[PDB]
């Protein structure tokens, strides 16, 4: 239900249409201020005429969209507000709703713009890992698992559409010491005797491994490990296609990908 | 008003109220003005039922009248000095438009009209105003 944007657009469109026709009619009250050379006011006249055409076209385009609204308006939710004045002190509800939404938007914008901090320095539990894994596992198309046969340290893997699974063995909170493979080439279930590491591939995913290592040394936030691993997995998910290759053609090299800024492009160029 | 009314009877393109109900206001206008005339000829009343009835304003009120006049030299008693440039602050065919569109002949009394008058057969007015106008010592011209 995102039709609110199109409806606000239509509001702006009709307001602009009214303003434009009013200004057009007001400008026709007088001729050229001081031409002294020609009657080039016809140019501005044709410009206003085209603006009217633009307005008509926008009105038509918005009439084409915004098909219809659903029946039973308000979905029976404010029936309490629709109720008699006996139970309604009801407007207080909408007031608090608007206040909460405004405060939320304000806090979000403030936090976003506060990213450029001014802190010159920063000075004067085997239960969060499972919780974080459970939270991250709720995400779709990206299945994870963990066995941890080494010890206190964490050992886990992730899966994707293909069989290009990734082996990530890190500490309790922050992700480090990761490696990548492709199409069961690792076989890290019972490799040799157990879930082996072997730190290797067939000389193709080495670039992907280097990129992931660089990313691990880039998304290393001072705190909030949940946000850290979320950024990590979002970065990982950006390779589900490996088909497009902007800033070049998709033939430059073996592959093309380096999206640390949530946007991929031809590698070996940054 | 009666001669312009007989003119309108002779030709339908007279000067109407220009606001609304243009096609019998002239009748009630004439009636009201005759009422004020009789009520003011021989030491009559001024600005009571007459006032109450004329207090009705039909949807016909026009505005934006010229009221032609010109600035002056208000040097009252002590001092008013003016420079040579950058002056310091102190017919009915328009005579006050928004944009300039002709030679813009200036005038002192009320006129501020066009120099060639850009017309075909109004030459009576132009002829009567060929020479200096009413106290037209300030009958000047100005560009732009």
Distance between CA atoms of residues A195 and A155, nearest Å: 10
Shortest CA distance from A39: residue in chain B: B101
CB A58 within 8 A of CB A13: yes
DSSP state of B132: -
CB B101 within 8 A of CB B111: no
- Give the CA angle between residues B132, B76, B81 to the nearest 5°: 80
Q: Which of A60, A56, A67, A74 is nearest to A3 (CA)?
A: A67
In terms of DSSP bridges, do strands A144-146 and A166-170 run parallel, antiparallel, or are they unpaired?
A: unpaired
**C-alpha distances in Å from residue A247, one per residue of A211, A215, A265, B93:** 18, 21, 6, 68
- Are A34 and B97 in contact (CB < 8 Å)? no
Distance between CA atoms of residues B55 and B32, nearest Å: 11
Residues of B with CB under 8 A from a CB of A: 97-101, 144
Q: How far is A48 from chain B (nearest CA, A)?
A: 20
> Which technique?
cryo-EM
Distance between CA atoms of residues A257 and A6, nearest Å: 35
Shortest CA distance from B144: residue in chain A: A34
Q: How many Å is the maximal CA-CA distance in chain B? A: 61
Q: Which of A58, A62, A56 is nearest to A21 (CA)?
A: A56
Token digits of residue A11:
């509001």
Token digits of residue A112:
């976003």
Distance between CA atoms of residues A9 and A11, nearest Å: 5
Mutate to test the interface with B, among A26, A27, A28, A31 (most CBs of B within 10 A): A31
- Give the CA angle between residues A51, B97, A38 to the nearest 5°: 55
Q: How far apart are the first and last CA of chain A?
A: 40
Cβ burial, residue B117 (10 Å; 0-12/13-18/19+): middle
Q: What is the resolution of this structure in A?
A: 4.7
Mutate to test the interface with B, among A26, A27, A28, A30 (most CBs of B within 10 A): A30
* b/e code B20-34 from CB counts within 10 Å (16+ = b): eeeeeebeeeeeeee
CB B85 within 8 A of CB B52: no
Distance between CA atoms of residues A98 and A119, nearest Å: 34
Residue with tokens 């031409």: A35
Q: Which helix (H) or strand (E) holds A44?
A: helix A41-64
Distance between CA atoms of residues B46 and B51, nearest Å: 9
Q: How many Å is the maximal CA-CA distance in chain A? A: 96
Q: Is A115 left (phi over 0), alpha (psi -120 to 50) or beta?
A: alpha
Residue with tokens 């939270």: A135
Task: Tell me the chain B residues in contact with residue A39 when contact means C-beta distances shorter than 8 Å.
Answer: none
- Give the CA angle between residues A198, A202, A205 to the nearest 5°: 90
Task: Tell me the chain B residues in contact with residue A34 when contact means C-beta distances shorter than 8 Å.
Answer: 99-100, 144
Token digits of residue A80:
């309490």
- Are B101 and A32 in contact (CB < 8 Å)? yes
- Are A30 and B99 in contact (CB < 8 Å)? yes
Cβ burial, residue A54 (10 Å; 0-12/13-18/19+): middle
């Amino acid at each position: 239900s995102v039709n609110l944007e199109a409806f606000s657009q239509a509001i702006s469109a009709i307001q602009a249409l009214r303003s434009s026709v009013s200004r057009v009619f007001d400008c026709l009250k007088d001729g050229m201020r001081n031409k002294e050379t020609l009657e080039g006011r016809e140019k501005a006249f044709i410009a206003h005429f085209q603006d009217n055409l633009h307005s008509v076209n926008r009105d038509l385009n918005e009439l084409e969209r915004l098909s219809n609204l659903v029946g039973k308006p308000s979905e029976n939710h404010p029936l309490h507000n629709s109720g008699l004045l006996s139970l309604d002190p009801y407007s207080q509800l909408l007031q608090a709703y608007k206040w909460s939404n405004k405060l939320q938007y304000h806090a979000g914008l403030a936090s976003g713009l506060l990213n450029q901090q001014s802190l010159k320095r920063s000075a004067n539990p085997q239960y969060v890992d499972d919780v974080i894994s459970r939270i991250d596992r709720m995400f779709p198309e990206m299945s994870i698992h963990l066995s941890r046969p080494n010890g206190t340290s964490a050992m886990l893997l992730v899966t994707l559409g293909k069989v290009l699974k990734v082996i990530v063995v890190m500490r309790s909170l922050f992700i480090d010491r990761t490696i990548v493979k492709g199409y069961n080439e690792n076989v890290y279930t019972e490799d040799g005797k157990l879930d082996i590491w072997s730190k290797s591939n067939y000389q193709v995913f080495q670039k992907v491994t280097d990129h992931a290592t660089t990313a691990l040394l880039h998304y290393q936030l001072p705190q909030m490990p949940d946000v850290v691993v979320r950024s990590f997995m979002t970065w990982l998910r950006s390779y589900i296609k490996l088909f497009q290759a902007p800033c070049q053609r998709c033939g430059k090299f073996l592959q093309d990908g380096l999206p640390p800024t949530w946007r991929d492009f031809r590698t070996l160029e940054a | 008003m009666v001669v312009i009314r007989i003119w309108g009877l002779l030709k339908p393109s007279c000067l109407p109220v220009y606001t609304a109900t243009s096609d019998d206001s002239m009748s009630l206008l004439f009636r009201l003005l005759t009422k004020l005339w009789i009520c003011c000829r021989d030491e009559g009343p001024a600005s009571p039922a007459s006032d109450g009835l004329v207090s009705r304003l039909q949807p016909k009120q026009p505005l934006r009248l010229q009221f032609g006049r010109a600035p002056t030299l208000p040097g009252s008693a002590a001092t008013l000095q003016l420079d040579g440039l950058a002056r310091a602050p102190g017919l009915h065919l328009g005579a006050c438009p928004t944009e300039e569109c002709k030679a813009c002949t200036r005038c002192g009394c009320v006129t501020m009209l066009k120099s060639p008058n850009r017309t075909t057969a109004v030459k009576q007015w132009e002829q009567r105003w060929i020479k200096n106008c009413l106290a037209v010592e300030g009958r000047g011209p100005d560009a732009c």
